[PDB]
Amino acid sequence: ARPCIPKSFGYSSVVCVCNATYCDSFDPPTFPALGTFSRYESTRSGRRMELSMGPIQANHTGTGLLLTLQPEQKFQKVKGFGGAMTDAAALNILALSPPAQNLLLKSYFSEEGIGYNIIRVPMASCDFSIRTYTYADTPDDFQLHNFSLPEEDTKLKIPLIHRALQLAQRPVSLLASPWTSPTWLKTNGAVNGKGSLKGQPGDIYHQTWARYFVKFLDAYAEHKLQFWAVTAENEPSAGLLSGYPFQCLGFTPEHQRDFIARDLGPTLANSTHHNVRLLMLDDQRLLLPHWAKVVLTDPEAAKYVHGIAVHWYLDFLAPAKATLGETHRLFPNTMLFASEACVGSKFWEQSVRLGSWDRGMQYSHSIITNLLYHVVGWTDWNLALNPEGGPNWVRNFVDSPIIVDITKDTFYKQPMFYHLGHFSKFIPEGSQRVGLVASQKNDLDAVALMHPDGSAVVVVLNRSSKDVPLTIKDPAVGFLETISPGYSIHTYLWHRQ
Amino acid sequence: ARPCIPKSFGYSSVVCVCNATYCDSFDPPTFPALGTFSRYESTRSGRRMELSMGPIQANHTGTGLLLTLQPEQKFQKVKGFGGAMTDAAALNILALSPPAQNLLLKSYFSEEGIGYNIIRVPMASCDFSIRTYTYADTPDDFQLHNFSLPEEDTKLKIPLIHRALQLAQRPVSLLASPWTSPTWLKTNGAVNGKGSLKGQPGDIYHQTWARYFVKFLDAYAEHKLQFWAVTAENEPSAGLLSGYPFQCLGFTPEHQRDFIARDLGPTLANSTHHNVRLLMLDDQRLLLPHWAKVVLTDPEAAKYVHGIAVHWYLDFLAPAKATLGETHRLFPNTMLFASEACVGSKFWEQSVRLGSWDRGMQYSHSIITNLLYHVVGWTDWNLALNPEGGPNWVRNFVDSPIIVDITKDTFYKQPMFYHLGHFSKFIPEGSQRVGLVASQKNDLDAVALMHPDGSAVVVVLNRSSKDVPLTIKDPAVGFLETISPGYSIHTYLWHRQ
Amino acid sequence: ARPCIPKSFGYSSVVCVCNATYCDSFDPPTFPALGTFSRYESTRSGRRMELSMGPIQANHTGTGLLLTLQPEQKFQKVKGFGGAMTDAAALNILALSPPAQNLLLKSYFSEEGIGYNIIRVPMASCDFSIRTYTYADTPDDFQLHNFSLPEEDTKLKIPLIHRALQLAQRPVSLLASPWTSPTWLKTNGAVNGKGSLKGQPGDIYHQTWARYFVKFLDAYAEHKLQFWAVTAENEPSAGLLSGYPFQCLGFTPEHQRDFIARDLGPTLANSTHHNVRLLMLDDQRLLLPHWAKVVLTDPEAAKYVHGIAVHWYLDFLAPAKATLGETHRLFPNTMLFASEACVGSKFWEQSVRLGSWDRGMQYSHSIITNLLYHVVGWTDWNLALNPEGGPNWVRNFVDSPIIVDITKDTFYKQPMFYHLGHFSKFIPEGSQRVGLVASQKNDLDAVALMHPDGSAVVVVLNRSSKDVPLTIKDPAVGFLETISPGYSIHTYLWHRQ
Amino acid sequence: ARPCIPKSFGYSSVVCVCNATYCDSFDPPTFPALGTFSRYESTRSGRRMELSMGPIQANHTGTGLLLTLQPEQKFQKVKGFGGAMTDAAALNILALSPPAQNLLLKSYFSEEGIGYNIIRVPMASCDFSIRTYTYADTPDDFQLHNFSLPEEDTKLKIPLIHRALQLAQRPVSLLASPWTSPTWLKTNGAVNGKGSLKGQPGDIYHQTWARYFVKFLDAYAEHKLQFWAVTAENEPSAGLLSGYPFQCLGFTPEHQRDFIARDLGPTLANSTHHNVRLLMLDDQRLLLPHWAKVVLTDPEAAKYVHGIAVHWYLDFLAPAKATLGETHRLFPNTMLFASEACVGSKFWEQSVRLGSWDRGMQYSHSIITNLLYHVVGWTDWNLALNPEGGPNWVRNFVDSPIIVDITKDTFYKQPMFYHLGHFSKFIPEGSQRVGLVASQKNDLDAVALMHPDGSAVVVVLNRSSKDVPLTIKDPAVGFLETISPGYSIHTYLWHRQ
Numbered sequence A, B, C, D: 001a002r003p004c005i006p007k008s009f010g011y012s013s014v015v016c017v018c019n020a021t022y023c024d025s026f027d028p029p030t031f032p033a034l035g036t037f038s039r040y041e042s043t044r045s046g047r048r049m050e051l052s053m054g055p056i057q058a059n060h061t062g063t064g065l066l067l068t069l070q071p072e073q074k075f076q077k078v079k080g081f082g083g084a085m086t087d088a089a090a091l092n093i094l095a096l097s098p099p100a101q102n103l104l105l106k107s108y109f110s111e112e113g114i115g116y117n118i119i120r121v122p123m124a125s126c127d128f129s130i131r132t133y134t135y136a137d138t139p140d141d142f143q144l145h146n147f148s149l150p151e152e153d154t155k156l157k158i159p160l161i162h163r164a165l166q167l168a169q170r171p172v173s174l175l176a177s178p179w180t181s182p183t184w185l186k187t188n189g190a191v192n193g194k195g196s197l198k199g200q201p202g203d204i205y206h207q208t209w210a211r212y213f214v215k216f217l218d219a220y221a222e223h224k225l226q227f228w229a230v231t232a233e234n235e236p237s238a239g240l241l242s243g244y245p246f247q248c249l250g251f252t253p254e255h256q257r258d259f260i261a262r263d264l265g266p267t268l269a270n271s272t273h274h275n276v277r278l279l280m281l282d283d284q285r286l287l288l289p290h291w292a293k294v295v296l297t298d299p300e301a302a303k304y305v306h307g308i309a310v311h312w313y314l315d316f317l318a319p320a321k322a323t324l325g326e327t328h329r330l331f332p333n334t335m336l337f338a339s340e341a342c343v344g345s346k347f348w349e350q351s352v353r354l355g356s357w358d359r360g361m362q363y364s365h366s367i368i369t370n371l372l373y374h375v376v377g378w379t380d381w382n383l384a385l386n387p388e389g390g391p392n393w394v395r396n397f398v399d400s401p402i403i404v405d406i407t408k409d410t411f412y413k414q415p416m417f418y419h420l421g422h423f424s425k426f427i428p429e430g431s432q433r434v435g436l437v438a439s440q441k442n443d444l445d446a447v448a449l450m451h452p453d454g455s456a457v458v459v460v461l462n463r464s465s466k467d468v469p470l471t472i473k474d475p476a477v478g479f480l481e482t483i484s485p486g487y488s489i490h491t492y493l494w495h496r497q
């Protein structure tokens, strides 16, 4: 319906500029007829999820690259795609004028946008907050008499979550994660630094902390929000590290095992929220498979654990086969889920690089590699940040797919936004990854899935500068002949019956 | 009553530690006979408003600096001293347990504390808020039917103000200032940035903004709070600067002149709040005397303007005689009032330096300089902040005289608090500044005033590291022999008959 | 000869992109014939020192703005324009390929560029260095036996200075300034922080420090470089400030007075370098006129002081009339010279803003205001920086007129470069400022000067968004009719005989 | 000989203070009889390589962990230990007075110190340089007629290396690595950034770059220095990354394979320096085993490659078995060597933490892990840095075992220095790692080796805070009863007959 308004900030590609009265958008979903395929294309040159349609051919000759669907090779089913409603994201969004707020929310959660169906919600403060607080800061309030949601929840996060759900056609799942407990539950008496829960699993400190989870879910349910899942702790390894700068709460794998078995599992199970799923780890994949082995080899913990949540940040230190792959082999019935991802990275680079094509490619490359190693969902980090990558009370600025410019009542949709959308818009919940085999060595990343209705979706990212002629074979329909431009990302869709 | 509990955090002096059950405090005042003086002393070495007495004698033993009272030289009368009940200050105070809250409020407002009699109240959000909002964010509501106070006012600010007034030694005057209007009244449609009211004075946008002042005063009057004064805009010059990040609303001096003459003046005068005073500028003294000349040489604006409000960034240097002095010389019948002061952080220092004696001296030096240049009152910025100088949704740059540590139910009284108190506790409303003659060049800052009852008060700040032998002469009583220790601050009081 | 290659980085205007094989450049100077005028125009829209010529008219009618030359009102003569060859600047320049280095140096120092004729040279390290060092770091080497120039001088600064002088058609003057002494000469034993020379003027510490100046000049003269001037210390007030973060050496005005009278003056005068000029202050103008009064009222110091050097950084705190104007009135025969200027400023803004028109306007506005208040020369700060504003060992990053992109063998000429050039290219040494009177209130900054040969030059900066029709009257030639576009800067030249 | 002079800077342990006249040192080694062991102990509490002796007894009194020597299990032989003579290290050493310089050099290279026998020498500039340069910056000199060594080599590095060799206990091996080629040989024409050699292996650019290695070895041989080895490129992968800020030269594994096979191998083999070894990779272990597979499965490249050089960023985590282990398994006849290690700063810590015990333990843990995965030598990065971690022309991120304070003619020996020394002093070239069996799970890191003369050496690092009772068994001698204090590091040595 409305095209990208491009703006260069001097980097490799353009952002799409939105404001109170204008934002690029899609037309309502259309579907290609049998014998035809749909193609969505984004390019560093500036194309943004442009739609085209081609014929499926009966024959193919040539020595060119062929990607053959293996529809009977069936793997994981997808839970969904989304991002995090941090204090920083909600503050930035609500600082825009109301019409601009609605265009930003529709960009993410509408079928006119990219169809997010997951929102991750911090349990009280994290580094992407402007102040440190928990829900129960009265010292030694073991009964949690003074547990309460502050305005960050009641005036920022919760109203935006309601509005996202109203705009979404797809059912949206909420995921919650805590960063720190109240300081009076901690060995170090501080929100950050090295420190764990006082005492030992089963004791008053651990029972109070497990009840804090239930109190959080109770409070959100009073605001008519229900959670699909919670994680046991954001980045439990961080609170094992001297001087760790952000809110944290350290657990060894054994401490997490015993906390889940004795306290969190049973307390959640005996609550009205017993159907909320519990995810373990919520940390860098290099902690796998060991963390999964420690927790899940104890049946009194394993019975409460639905899944394993991973973060992308340190992916470069550990191969995905040795971490995700081996974890799946050991525990095939325990889903893997990517609970946090982000790019404000290289030290010679700014936290926010408006128009960076490379950071978009980093997202799509990680999503494809995750899908090939059994991951069922992805939540990005901050849904929106300001041009500095904030606010953040420790100045740990990073990038975000949408950058808000409050002084101009403007927001910018980054290449990351469209790279994410090439998956989130076209891979609904229940889609199952299937096999896809290449005829020759190539510089492409590709993944195939089948929708619940049987239709096919393939995403292709060209990591190279070179255009790559390519054919996709579906023995059900025929041959899809196409070209992957260098530094492009394509999503292909076609019916099989 | 109760002495300071000192604690050092590695800076040049100590803070005084208060909690739910303990805070340093004063006994009720006690007036010694003619021939005796009272001294209150605070020192970098750790003395905190410690009381002593001594004689005023007929013979002069000193041979050093003489300061002679000249009570027949009469200058301005004092309106008072206080600070700002920002969202941040209120949030921090209310994070303490109720007994701790009351000790903090008594510290500022009680005769057990330092006797503040001014509170400055932001009209809706500013940078020391946890979110952006105005009282009328629903757009295109020019009659302001949907004007309303949010929880920041009805739950945080107004109850705290009521409690301060209940505790107050003296009648407290309230002062209101707006940061931004609803953004649908602004040229840039944003809460911050370079932007003014749309249109021109007299038109629907300016009439609506003047009505917004009346709606605000109406709302607070429904909660049984009456204002002594309002400023025309906080920092009007800031909204003329591209990219200005805090909530703002830009006015040139000519725009403010015409807004006052056509819209704000008449509208307030035609309301039940016609007795509320209106102060102009509310900005850095650098803008004087020009801003005063522009506004006050127009009789249709001048008739509505009671005074000129000035801000102080206490870290910088500027020219008081050239700004405050020359403004008084040109407009001697228009009071000068300091509506905001704070000690920023030089870029190499933290926002909050617990125990900084230097930041305390910057306060007392500023107050003395102001009193010597005809200023009638002095209002601090945030009454309380957390240890990071927040919450602030944009950036933490300033300190506060009271720092709250929520996680320990404690608050710290900084040297700034006592340097303020050496004036606020001992200079009631209606006190008059009078002459004080130094007999020779010296390193002290000093000012003399007369209480309404005719008794004397002299404040002496020693900027230098050296003890200074000092004599103070009252022609009516005799000679007060004393010593001003290096870095110290003293308040002397004595009956004159 | 070669036009600007424009590139936007998303700010208000464009940079001009240069590399090893291309840089925008001028044709050799041309001169308009009597009855005609030359106009150079730069605009936010992207014009860069574009040349045009018009007729001088005999008559003029209208109520429009008229600027009338007052050629017999004669003021100061100009020394020149340039910038600082810091370690950071030289490192950045020499990291480019050799052909690119030459295009960058010609941009500044050639008649194909903007004709710089001053270079300021730090005496050893400052904040725009990658390491702290002095020329004499052996402790207690009062004889300066181990005084030596490091590679920063011999391999970076000195070779670039030689090459700039070779490219310059105009004679270039060098100005030197120290930041710190060796630490063993200082009360605090550190390169930064609060600290002055040990002892008292006339003693061994002060004699050694004065001899260090002579040793520096000796060493540079062995490399065939001679200095026009030295300053007594960069920013002497900075070393009076607790925690000052960069290299510094504190002097009160009295200490500087006595150091010059007893040590620096006589030591320089008795050296082979006795013709080098000595400038005092080299600090913010707010220290004037007091600093000038203290130093120059002592005839034993005044006899050695040629001039007063000022920095722009804190100009906003003190009016130029009260500082520069009053200093000129008191000491009319002691030249005023702007020894440092820079813009990496507002806290909500990046250190480097590629293409910022506003920062260019800030330069031209300051140069005009300086010229109107008797200043004879201007040296910008760093001649070139990287895109972060560095390197700088304390991360005190700021902007620069040329930004080097080493990875791309590219450099960017900022709007500041062209705003500077509108003065430096067209105001040779010996030009005398003359009177220029406006017919009506206007939003223009303008300054007129006469070249040694009698020709006229006028620079006009339009601070407003609005085009301003304008006439300039020279009773010698006639009327120059023109328009100043909004946000433009023009230089006009015409012969008078 | 002389003990440590401890000084604390607020971190977890002390540094040892050395100056012109004092540095801690060792007596000449002394070998006790069969049945006696020597222990050298360093502790967080402040012991520094303190020597004690005790008995190896026939009876075992301990009941805790047993470590049993298995001398018939023989693994790799050790080449040695050392560090890098960067421009920065040389500048820092030469800033000391000559007597202090000699104590620093003896600390590293003397039997009075820790017996280093490897020095890594950059071929021209890197980030730890004060300027950019290569040996052939004059462009288009393909025969390299203008190749020459600058003062960094002839004045700083080469004289220091000669002095180190004069002092050295043992024959010292020199190892050379280039960061960038002359930029006129590079695709991007810049010293850093994403860029490789122009053209393809075998052509004039690659032939010239291989000749550059021979010219470098020629030049150093003229100064009577011979190299044991050279690496093909420092960090070849870094030059494949857009924006990489340090000097670099990018090679894919295939490009390195073909460069070695066609140009560098043959050229070195045809020179008088044919005996110099060539090491491949010189990069992070993450690139293994892939990089090794690509290069070493090509026989025309493999015949020139003596070993694989690896880097360690000691702050991160990675997988040694998956990289070093698997590379040894696949290429068991190709030695592994650690060519660079350093402890970066987590973003919340300073580059240099004077006295950090943790950074010391990171060194000894890395060395033990390497020795257990077949690595034959371990080379630190900068031998010395200043207190800010410089000089570095790009950024300061890493610590160094010796920190020089020029302004006090002193240098500080960090815990890193002694943790290194527990290996370097006691493991001469030709020592062989042998088996050591732990009797039960434990928290110690330990490794055993045999000197060429057959005596034993065992290093034991206690990562935990708890004292660990320990027994060490030599089947040939008996039982050594000891205790490993929490955090400590011990080296044990004993004769076996």
Ligand SMILES: O=C(Nc1ccc(Cl)cc1)c1cccc(S(=O)(=O)Nc2ccccc2C(=O)O)c1
Pocket (backbone or CB within 6 Å): B070, B073, B372, B434, B435, B436, B437, B438, B439, B442, B444, B445, B446, B447
């Ligand atoms: O030395 C004086 N001041 C002073 C100096 C140093 C320090 Cl530490 C403290 C005080 C002083 C000097 C002359 C007259 C008076 S005065 O008492 O007659 N006051 C005045 C008289 C005429 C105009 C203005 C005033 C006014 O007080 O502003 C006071």
Ligand SMILES: O=C(Nc1ccc(Cl)cc1)c1cccc(S(=O)(=O)Nc2ccccc2C(=O)O)c1
Pocket (backbone or CB within 6 Å): D070, D073, D372, D434, D435, D436, D437, D438, D439, D442, D444, D445, D446, D447
């Ligand atoms: O417990 C052992 N190690 C150890 C554990 C903990 C600590 Cl703290 C220190 C040492 C060990 C176990 C089995 C065999 C051997 S071995 O001595 O026979 N060595 C080997 C035998 C076969 C293959 C490889 C090796 C090799 O040493 O790498 C050593």
